[PDB]
Structures are given as structure tokens and as C-alpha cells.
Amino acid sequence: MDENINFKQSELPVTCGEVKGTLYKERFKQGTSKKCIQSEDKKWFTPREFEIEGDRGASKNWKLSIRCGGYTLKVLMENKFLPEPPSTRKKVTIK
């Protein structure tokens, strides 16, 4: 059902510790398996390499270290914004 962050724009706004960025759908299909976030340094980073620049690197969990439009990847992967293997099921809490 989505909310306010439409990924149909080919570009999804991300924010890792105030470190905003541009997410590319062409690679988003893999998430942490393909760098689709372009930083002001004119370079693409992976949800992990980005967590290092936004947080520090010891954050470990990148699904929480980075946000997207409002909700982190952890939630974005829990609602529907991101594909990934069977998230959970139906009638699940949190959108």
C-alpha cells in the first residue's frame, strides 16, 4: 500500500545519520548487494559502506543506521517498499 515515499520515481531519498543520498531502483532490487546511494561526493555507496559514513561503522545493523524518506530499511523491508525474501506474512503490525 506504501505511504508517502513512492519508489516509482526510480530515485528514493535516503538519509544515513544526516548523510542524505539518492537511491537507485536499478540496483535497489539487491539493496545491500548493490551500491545505489549517491552521496555528495559523486559516488555510490552500499547500505553498509553508507552506514560507515553516516554512523561510523560499528553500528553493525545497516537496516537501522540508514533511513529512507522517513522509515529505515529495516521497516522498508518489513512493510513492502523493498522486495527481499518472505518478509513475514499477512496482518502484520507496522507499516
CATH classification at residue 80: 3.10.390.10
User: How many folded domains does the chain comprise?
Assistant: 1
Find the domain containing 16 and state its range: 1-95
Closest CA to 21 of 42, 5, 38, 6: 38
CA distance 48 to 55: 10
At 39 the three-state DSSP class reads strand
Structure solved using which method? NMR
Quickly tell me which residue has 544526516 as its cell. Answer: 18
Q: Please give the sequence-ordered ranges of beta strands (E in DSSP) within 1-95, or none if there are none.
A: 11-16, 19-24, 37-39, 43-45, 67-68, 71-72
Placement of cell 531502483 in the chain: 25
- Residue length of the chain: 95
Cβ contacts of residue 62 below 8 Å, gap of 6+? 32, 47, 48, 50, 51, 73
Give the other-Cβ count within 10 Å of 82's Cβ.
Answer: 19
The 37-39 sheet, strands edge to edge:
43-45, 37-39, 19-24, 11-16, 67-68, 71-72
How far apart, in whole angstroms, are the C-alpha atoms of residue 42 and residue 38? 6
